Amino acid sequence: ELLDSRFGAKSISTIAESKRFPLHEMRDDVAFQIINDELYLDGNARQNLATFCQTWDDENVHKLMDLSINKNWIDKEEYPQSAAIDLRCVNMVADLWHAPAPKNGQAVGTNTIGSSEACMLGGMAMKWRWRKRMEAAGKPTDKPNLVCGPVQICWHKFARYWDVELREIPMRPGQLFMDPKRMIEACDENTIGVVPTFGVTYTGNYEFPQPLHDALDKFQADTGIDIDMHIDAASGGFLAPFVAPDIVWDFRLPRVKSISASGHKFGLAPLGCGWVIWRDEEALPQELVFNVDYLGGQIGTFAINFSRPAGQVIAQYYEFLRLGREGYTKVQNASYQVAAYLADEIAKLGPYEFICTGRPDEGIPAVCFKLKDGEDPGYTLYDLSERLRLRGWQVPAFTLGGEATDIVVMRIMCRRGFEMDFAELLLEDYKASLKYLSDHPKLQGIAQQNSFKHT
Amino acid sequence: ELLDSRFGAKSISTIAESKRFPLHEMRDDVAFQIINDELYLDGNARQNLATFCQTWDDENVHKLMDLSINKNWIDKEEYPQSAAIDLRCVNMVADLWHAPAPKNGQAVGTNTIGSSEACMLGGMAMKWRWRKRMEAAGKPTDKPNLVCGPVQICWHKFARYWDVELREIPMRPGQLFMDPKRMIEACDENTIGVVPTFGVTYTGNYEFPQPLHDALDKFQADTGIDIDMHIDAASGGFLAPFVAPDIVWDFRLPRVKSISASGHKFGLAPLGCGWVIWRDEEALPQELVFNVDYLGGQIGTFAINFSRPAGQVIAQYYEFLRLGREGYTKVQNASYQVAAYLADEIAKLGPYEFICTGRPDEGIPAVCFKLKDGEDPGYTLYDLSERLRLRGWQVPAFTLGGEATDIVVMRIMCRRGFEMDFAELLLEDYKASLKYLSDHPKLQGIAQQNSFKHT
Amino acid sequence: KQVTDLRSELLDSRFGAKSISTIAESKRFPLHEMRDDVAFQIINDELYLDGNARQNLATFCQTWDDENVHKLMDLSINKNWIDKEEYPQSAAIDLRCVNMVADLWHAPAPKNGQAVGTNTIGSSEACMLGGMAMKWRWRKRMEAAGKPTDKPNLVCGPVQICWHKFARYWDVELREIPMRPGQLFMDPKRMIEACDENTIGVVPTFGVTYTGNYEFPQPLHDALDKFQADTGIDIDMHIDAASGGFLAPFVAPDIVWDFRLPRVKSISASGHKFGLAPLGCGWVIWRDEEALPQELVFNVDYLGGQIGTFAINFSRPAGQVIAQYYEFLRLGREGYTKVQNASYQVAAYLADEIAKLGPYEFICTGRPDEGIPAVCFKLKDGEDPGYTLYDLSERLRLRGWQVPAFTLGGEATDIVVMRIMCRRGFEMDFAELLLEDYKASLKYLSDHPKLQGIAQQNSFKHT
Amino acid sequence: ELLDSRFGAKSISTIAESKRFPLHEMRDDVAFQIINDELYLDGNARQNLATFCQTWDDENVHKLMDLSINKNWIDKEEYPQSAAIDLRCVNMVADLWHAPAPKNGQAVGTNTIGSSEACMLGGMAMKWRWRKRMEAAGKPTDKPNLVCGPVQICWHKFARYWDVELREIPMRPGQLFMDPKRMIEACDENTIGVVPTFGVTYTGNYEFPQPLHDALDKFQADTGIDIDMHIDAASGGFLAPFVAPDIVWDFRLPRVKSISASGHKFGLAPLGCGWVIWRDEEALPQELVFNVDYLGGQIGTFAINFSRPAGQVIAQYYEFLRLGREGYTKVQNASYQVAAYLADEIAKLGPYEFICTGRPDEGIPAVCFKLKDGEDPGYTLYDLSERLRLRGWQVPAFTLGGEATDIVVMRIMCRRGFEMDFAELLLEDYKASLKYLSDHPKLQGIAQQNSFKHT
Numbered sequence A, B, D: 001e002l003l004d005s006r007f008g009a010k011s012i013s014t015i016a017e018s019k020r021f022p023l024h025e026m027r028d029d030v031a032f033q034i035i036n037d038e039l040y041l042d043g044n045a046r047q048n049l050a051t052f053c054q055t056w057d058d059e060n061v062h063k064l065m066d067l068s069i070n071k072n073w074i075d076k077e078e079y080p081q082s083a084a085i086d087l088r089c090v091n092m093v094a095d096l097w098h099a100p101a102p103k104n105g106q107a108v109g110t111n112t113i114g115s116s117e118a119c120m121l122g123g124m125a126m127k128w129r130w131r132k133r134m135e136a137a138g139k140p141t142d143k144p145n146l147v148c149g150p151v152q153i154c155w156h157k158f159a160r161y162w163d164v165e166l167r168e169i170p171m172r173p174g175q176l177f178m179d180p181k182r183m184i185e186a187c188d189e190n191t192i193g194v195v196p197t198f199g200v201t202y203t204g205n206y207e208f209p210q211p212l213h214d215a216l217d218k219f220q221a222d223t224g225i226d227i228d229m230h231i232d233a234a235s236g237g238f239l240a241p242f243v244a245p246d247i248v249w250d251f252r253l254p255r256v257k258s259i260s261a262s263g264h265k266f267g268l269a270p271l272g273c274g275w276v277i278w279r280d281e282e283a284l285p286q287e288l289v290f291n292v293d294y295l296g297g298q299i300g301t302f303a304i305n306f307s308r309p310a311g312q313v314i315a316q317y318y319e320f321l322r323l324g325r326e327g328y329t330k331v332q333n334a335s336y337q338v339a340a341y342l343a344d345e346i347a348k349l350g351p352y353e354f355i356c357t358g359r360p361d362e363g364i365p366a367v368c369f370k371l372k373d374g375e376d377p378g379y380t381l382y383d384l385s386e387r388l389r390l391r392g393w394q395v396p397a398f399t400l401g402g403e404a405t406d407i408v409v410m411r412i413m414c415r416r417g418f419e420m421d422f423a424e425l426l427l428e429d430y431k432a433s434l435k436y437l438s439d440h441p442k443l444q445g446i447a448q449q450n451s452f453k454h455t
Numbered sequence C: 001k002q003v004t005d006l007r008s009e010l011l012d013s014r015f016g017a018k019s020i021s022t023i024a025e026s027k028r029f030p031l032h033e034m035r036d037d038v039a040f041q042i043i044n045d046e047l048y049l050d051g052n053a054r055q056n057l058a059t060f061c062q063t064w065d066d067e068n069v070h071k072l073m074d075l076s077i078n079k080n081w082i083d084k085e086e087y088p089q090s091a092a093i094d095l096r097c098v099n100m101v102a103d104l105w106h107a108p109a110p111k112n113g114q115a116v117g118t119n120t121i122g123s124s125e126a127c128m129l130g131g132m133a134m135k136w137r138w139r140k141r142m143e144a145a146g147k148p149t150d151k152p153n154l155v156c157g158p159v160q161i162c163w164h165k166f167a168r169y170w171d172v173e174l175r176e177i178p179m180r181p182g183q184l185f186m187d188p189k190r191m192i193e194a195c196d197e198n199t200i201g202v203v204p205t206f207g208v209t210y211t212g213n214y215e216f217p218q219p220l221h222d223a224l225d226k227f228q229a230d231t232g233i234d235i236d237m238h239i240d241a242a243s244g245g246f247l248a249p250f251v252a253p254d255i256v257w258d259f260r261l262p263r264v265k266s267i268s269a270s271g272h273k274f275g276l277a278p279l280g281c282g283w284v285i286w287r288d289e290e291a292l293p294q295e296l297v298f299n300v301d302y303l304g305g306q307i308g309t310f311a312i313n314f315s316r317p318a319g320q321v322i323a324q325y326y327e328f329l330r331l332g333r334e335g336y337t338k339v340q341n342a343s344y345q346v347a348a349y350l351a352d353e354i355a356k357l358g359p360y361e362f363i364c365t366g367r368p369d370e371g372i373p374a375v376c377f378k379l380k381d382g383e384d385p386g387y388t389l390y391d392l393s394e395r396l397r398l399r400g401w402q403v404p405a406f407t408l409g410g411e412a413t414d415i416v417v418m419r420i421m422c423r424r425g426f427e428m429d430f431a432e433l434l435l436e437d438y439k440a441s442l443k444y445l446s447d448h449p450k451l452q453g454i455a456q457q458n459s460f461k462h463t
Ligand SMILES: Cc1ncc(COP(=O)(O)O)c(CN)c1O
Pocket: A052, A113, A114, A115, A116, A117, A119, A151, A152, A153, A154, A197, A199, A200, A201, A232, A234, A235, A262, A274, A454, A455, B305, B306, B307
């Protein structure tokens, strides 16, 4: 007769008969506690330096989210003020990225669940534009390809799910990104677009759309093939407009037909928010828009999702209102300041070569380094990653894709709430780890599992 | 210069600085109040009988959601307990639908944001299975079609986005649903699958998979053509297993390779929860599964979205645990009792012809009706709907699709929280409106806009 | 052949248990206990059918929420206003409010440091108290003069219902100066005509419920002076300043309406209107000890000696007084002036904007020197824009708004007006959105001419 | 230069600018803290045994009241559900007190802010009924009187405010309440009615209506004069129906035309809730009723107040619903158990004579006693009351009215939350005080201020 020390009663196991739908009722408050108690086993992510997504808490965001638990984004009739708020965000994000001022006062874009949806949506519209143009000219439309650099996994999914051929320019030592030369070599009249990554996941560096844009202009000159771009700005999109307004990467570039980003990365929204914006009505094929009947007349949607919570848009709106440009600038500078500082300090502690050092004009606030080629300080980065985990930190070590499959890097993400003091403390732990490693030479070479690298 | 009476300070208009990204910071607690006050203009949906989604509030769900605001469903490393709760639900749903007990102890399915993503996933798997089968028979794969009845807009989206021809059997009078005879005429060797809708959005009725299944068995006998099904049980999927276990619609049928439903409809989860289950490992082409690397190995996802909150899954788990089968039977029975009462009471109040009378063996808890042909009681259903809005209720009137385009109906949705007393009150207001329309005959015919119908 | 699995009793989807109905079982006192949390949920659930009043522009009462008012109210649920013994600190606070209000209205500085006045549940109670004391003063002056006291009358303009109640309940004849086109208010000429030696007082309404205009007490005061010079009859006033009472002192301190005028013997107003207190708070102040006849004061024994009360109510919560005190303290003259100005800004903009949308004649355009923050208008005479204000009201309800249209009293019973109340929380942005919905409705009414003339029920007009 | 230690800032005194309206703004949170701090000087009433009103806290009641802060009882249009609940309460109270089942389904009554207004209202209705009768008979209506026993102050108010001669039958030793003999001596054709008090404030005893009713029946036989009754059941009204249903005091007696009670006494509602119910339509002269226009028709009010919170009615409803008869019987008995106990136990502690010992068939849960005539234990009750204050308790010692002005009583009110355990502790403190008075004989005779005795 198994008992539970919590309830002073007969034990209900969650693991026994977690394989069948449960047969019986159980008191609501007991069910709540059992789950609540399980959840203590989840991490809080504050010491997690792998993830990009918002992990900090603001009481106001909890209140907005909690008011919004039942508020259906798709139901414009019942929730007309949430609907209004969503459209302001669309306009505000469009403005931020130099979208040509919209003819009717309303920018062409949509909120999404994350950058993943936002990319498939950008992806579909590219395909359709390329398909329309090619049928008009009487040509085969069965073999579209996409040209890009070391892209996030959403692009591999989009390519697979929509039968487009992924021409990914491989990462290679001393050329880790998509350069203009290799881009051009991979393009022809079946290329639907080119996708630069404005903040490479693996390393934190920017892929600068301008030099690529110039190559595509030249390419049109030489071949007559007119290629559009879509900027995956999952993280850059809410960084560069504030701390590096000089970098031309957005709608300021004529070939850029759409951009996407994550609200719930550096836009500071809570998990469950992305954005995609098109340059104008022509960037978005009408065949893709579905009009749904409501009382005030009908509205068009381009989204994969239908019903879903409006909480994250309202929270996004709250970030936008309370910070503005002036506010976001100070926030993102804070992060860059932390990244820079970690970068300089870590350089002093071993023979490291730095792929990314958290400068605002090169990428996102991220430190990314590898060991110097053919040097051996007595540990690998997997080893050091293991030591830091014992001190509560999740600092991922992993190998790159492509022809740089030989290279192991360590990458640190600096997000909101990882302030200068927690960086100090990481550093103390970092140093203590180097010390234990050197006191225990036997540890070398042992750890060999990659960590989660994707978001 | 303009002041605000809440703050006794210079006014900030959210409607003036609404077009561009704001330049200045504002005090957090003022942004919060500004937004909080706007959201009072949203409805609370408790008198809305137009929607399927949960709008009831339970204190434990709010707590679970609130703890879960940052829990990343995709980050199995940091949130391993959330990961575990998710997998449990997958098994529990599979079990509910009579999926073959799984070999390795883990059923084949995934959580989704809603039924929209669930259906595209199932839709994509149908396409690939059909493709693989044609390529083996050395036949062309360029003209896929999908056969179905009056489906929810997500299937129109699917067919557009993925280049499949939608053969929608049209609603017509005395013939609203996909019947076996009409289904068979639309089938051929390019049909990727047939999708019954187990709870038709427009009317509430079930399309019964079993007689369709018999027709497809006969169809393969006669032509050698072996057509699969995917059941869109958006609403029925959490009703029938409890209050009509003897309706054979699920994996008990060999042709049914996958099923989807909404957790946030009758599965009682909060907004942002959907499910899709496949019959077994072979129903899911591996080319569609993506393996992400993590510390404890690697898990395979099939999902359009990537990062996204885990609260909904956790809340769904709460509902499963606290109610079980005995609980859910009680809960759904309650809604059924309401709808059946409403249908009986309303029938006595006008010259009405009923398409759906809210019985558990016919469909979901919904009453759906139209005016009897050639009868004219001095008003239209649009008219009665507008009178009802004035007494706070949202009871939609709209026209059916296909050939029944001519037909106006009123459709009442009974969800959790809309209890017998509330139904009594609506009944009073309905009578009160009937009277006011009879006292003011000039009102007949004026209102003619369709209401939100789609979920 | 069955396929179902049903239970043979009525169930509730919330509780997965047997149904309990509030509606049958609403007829007799209930016989059985029920679980507390279930009782609570059943009730809380029903209350979602109440409006939140944010789009209700018919009411004067406070509808905005402020976290601190909620906490203060929540601490005070049990605090009994009448129980000076147990809640000496609440008693102190109440006394401070009375002084601050007196002070705000230029009451003569009290001899003993304590003004003569009381808190009440709302203006209704305030007014009966003012009316009672007026009646008693007059009764005594006549008894002194050995005259008959059985036929008292009260002169006033288009007043709120409470005066109709007071007049009935207390056997006083109501000489209401009737509203009529182009003279909607008690004017000096018609007031004088109604006045004789049984007039206990004249009651200017400083903020008319129906329209929002001020009846200005000073011209009336002048007439009443001239009237004494001619007849020797000495008539008192009492100002029903229900709403204007917490407006003019901040935005129009030059309008002479209060104790600055010697005939004004008491003033009443609502804290839970432009006072900004939460529902259930009024005030009445007497000029001095002599204005409140001792016969009306009841003395009750407490441990610290005895205190005198002039209240209709006895036991009652102190929350609103404390809440009112919070408002006074946190705002001051400086804060009120701002908060009040904000509301007048909304009214002025609505009035200037709405004027452009149809053929309207304006009774009140929300100007600080004319009345309260209210917009009140009627259709111009003999214009037919294609709808009545009743119809326009209806289309507005469908968009969530409650903007009343109702007929005026007296001889103007032939006029339909629309009135918009602008209170705290109804800010410029919300006024922008009303304007959009108003425009949308006009467009709907113009594309759908059959709607004209159909709607004809009066909306709630009184507070 | 003066500082506050709480805010480490320039001091604000509430005592300075308690004289004039304040000039300046302060920070909201500071204002709030200042006030909150002063409130700590208020008692919490748990040891106050002088009062009648509810002083116990229940979480649900707090939430309801807090939901209802803006809910306007008069505004039937905006808060239709609060209106509906109000009306149910009228019906439940009517039934409770054996009112004749109302014709049209709605009993004639109204909620009020307390017993005081409810008494005013019943009083006016009495004065009108007599007025109308007398006019019809062509007789003087200028000299109305009221006959009553030791009434609560509201009846003295009633009489002054409405020009009715109060004929209060005075208390006298051995005869403390209105008895039929003296009642009849005071009655005539100008008597608007007799008011028995069903739970006398000063003592706790019931004035029994039935023997008076017989006296009034006999009276009408001898003289032709027909005299109505109003019961003041401020406290008795929510006691006898549960623990003494046999006492015939209510609408079972035909001459009872109206009854009034406090919700916030033994009705268990929070402060600000009273009831008055009429026997039927005819009991309530239509002159007194005012019709206000709303949209759903028009409603009749008979109230002194106009705008006011609906929180308390709602709270009252919750108490009714959750408890019922069976609950109320339990709650009320428990209080009687306490007062019975105190009465037996105090009896043993000195030379006391009891006026009221907390028996259900005699009065409310109160103990009221005086020192035995010509007996001197060496203290007065005033002295005992003061000793008890020192140890936290408020136990009032006062003198009775009329011809018992020679008499000092102590009176203990036993209300909800003053449970057996607290009585026990009062007894301990009671014994210690007597011991202190015994050891310190000088203390005797010194204290002489009457306590608050009225509610
Ligand atoms: C470049 C890029 N694009 C897409 C994504 C996916 O974003 P989300 O998880 O917000 O859907 C990420 C995060 N990995 C990314 O770095």
